[model samples]
Target: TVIKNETGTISISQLNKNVWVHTELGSFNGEAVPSNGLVLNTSKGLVLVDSSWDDKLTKELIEMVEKKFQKRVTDVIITHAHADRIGGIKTLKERGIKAHSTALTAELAKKNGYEEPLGDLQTVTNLKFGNMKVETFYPGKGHTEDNIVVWLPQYNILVGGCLVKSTSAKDLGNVADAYVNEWSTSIENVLKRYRNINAVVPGHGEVGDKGLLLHTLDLLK
Candidate 1:
């Protein structure tokens, strides 16, 4: 563990030399939940895949990450407009960190009453941070219309965000804004793009492999 708060609400751990996973504890339907995000260390700066539940938790996460990597978080890629994903937009902005998202996500975030991020991502954007290359892909509409996944090519890691489910997840969560009929196709899109994934981090629950994507497809069925 790179750093875990005493209350266990937040934790960060190394996945490789330049990648780490950060988990922020939360609750859904009265059940305790933990949301997952990514931290990428690079020669240019640190890049975050998503933020935590709120500004407070996000602030703590940034501190832990900066302290461990000795680099400030220079940019963040918000997967969707949900509070669990874009809750720290204000924090990131105040800290002078760049918050990036798809134009759709940016509009949705604003509609959802959160500070907007830079809506600069495209359908398949390849971002290079130092020697590391990260890919952001819009796999159609699944969890939400704007939900996207991050691919870490160098490490074979995919930060699945809320679109991909952990193996233990029995049901698709929070379908209030989900595209139920099209979710499977979206999963297929992801499978078509990535294969032999080493690790897949779900928004909540334990991390697994490509099996997680298969499991999500099953749940969607």
Candidate 2:
């Protein structure tokens, strides 16, 4: 019952015990957004990270989750308010999934014309999964006022939602609403806090090392 696309963009696989990362291509970059969603095989059910873009890809990801994990998506944690990041909410909602994001994201989404919740959007101040703790940080401001990063203390993985790229070497994505002044500081805070970060997942690039954050900080300097 798993569905896939020809883009080689959609990858539905297991990474570790109780954790699965869903990767897909971004309409903005045409590059696969690695580890886009995290499926935590928890006792309650699967907890999804940012849903992939579009109804098709979203549906495809959902099916993959159901078939591979044999569980329905009970909760969704949206990384930010970007359309590409949260666009697939409709598909999740169709399957009866509950979604949550930052309160600022909800406000910004409406201000930027994304009226109406993208699949049951709820304000998430902070959250936890079993023995793990998930906290949200505004990190000042970069990309957008609503931009926030997810810190997975248990795994030491920092989910940089467009604020931190996979590489300090790669050109940054759209900075239309970006606050250039505070971007560097925000990224610096991420690096400073998550010193033991084992992996870095950007909102629109390949997955890479945490040094990417340092590189970005240096570049901004």
Candidate 3:
């Protein structure tokens, strides 16, 4: 499941029966840039981890999900306040979809001139999406002051967003808004907290096992 068009490439693959992953590739800095997001098919509706790069890509993703699952996206969990992560807020709002983020992230987004998320979660909050249980935790600051990770205990999947980098990354991708000095310790907390993650999905690039978390720590150092 991968489809390519003039806009970019969109790939959808099942991580498990309850969760699936969708990746989109677009041009950034004259090079192909990939962004990863997750889709959870809950009894209530669909939950999106992050929107695509922009409105256009976000719309495409929504359409693809609707076609595949026959359900609308009801909630979006923004991992950070960066444009690449929350760029589709306008679209989501227009569709009456609820968007959530850490309180710090919502404040930061507003300060950065981006639309704020509709709801805010604490440092560690457990939410029930229909029958699925999700844990959203702030493992300290690394990629951004408000970056957070989502954990699905049932699936043993950890969505690290930009807080963790793919193994293919040579170095930390963007450190402009990052706490470089505290990056390693931040990831250290994540590793110490989640010990049984079977799959780790970074904000970009390919997904792998817990090795991605260790690799990200190495990059920060």
Candidate 1, residues 91-119, lDDT tens digits: the string is 99999999989999999999989999999
Best-first order by TM-score: 1, 3, 2
Those runs of model 2 whose alpha carbons end farther than 4 Å from true positions after fitting are 1-7, 29-35, 113-125, 130-132
**Two-way TM-score contest, 2 vs 3, winner:** 3
Best-to-worst lDDT order: 1, 3, 2
Q: Which whole-number lDDT from 0 to 100 does residue 138 have in model 1?
A: 96
- TM-score, per-candidate, Cα-based: 0.96, 0.82, 0.94
Clashes of 1: 0
Q: What is each predicted model's overall lDDT from 0 to 1?
A: 0.89, 0.68, 0.86
Residue-by-residue lDDT tens digits, candidate 3, 70-169:
9888998999988888888888989888998888888888988887896569989998989989999998888988899999999889999988889889
Q: Compared with the true structure, what per-residue lDDT tens digits does model 2 show for residues 1-221? A: 23354567687545556665677765666654443666677766777777777777777777767776786777777766778766876766666777676666766666656643432323234566555466666676787766777767777777786777666346656777778789888887777776887777766555667877776666555
Q: In candidate 1, where is summed lDDT lowest over 10 consecutive residues? A: 1-10
lDDT, candidate 2, at 207: 62
Clashing pairs in 3: none
Q: Is candidate 2 or candidate 3 better by lDDT?
A: 3
